[PDB]
Amino acid sequence: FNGLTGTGVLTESNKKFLPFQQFGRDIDDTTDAVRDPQTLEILDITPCS
Amino acid sequence: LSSTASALGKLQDVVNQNAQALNTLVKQLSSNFGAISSVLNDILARLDPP
């Protein structure tokens, strides 16, 4: 997604990104949510099993 | 027990120590360590094998 890369399971989420923020973050600086640059819908990321 | 706090100091101390150790282990993944970048994907896909 737009430069930042990774792997995992994508899911729909209900976060409240500010109108200029791109991707969320966690306590330990591990990417958690993203905003896909085609429909501006927040999207959640889960680690594999 | 009900009103006053800080009686259960020892168990809370144990939990805090474990959490801090784990957090500082995880946090050590963003250090450069003398390489050119912290992340391995870009450095693997941007230069020659040598």
Ligand SMILES: *[C@@H]1O[C@H](CO)[C@@H](O[C@@H]2O[C@H](CO)[C@@H](O)[C@H](O)[C@H]2NC(C)=O)[C@H](O)[C@H]1NC(C)=O
């Ligand atoms: C980029 O292009 C896409 C597709 O061309 C646009 O997607 C539209 O999204 C809205 C709601 O998100 C839909 O109601 C439209 O039907 C979509 N258009 C099409 C053609 O399917 C999108 O708006 C464009 N702009 C951005 C910033 O993503």
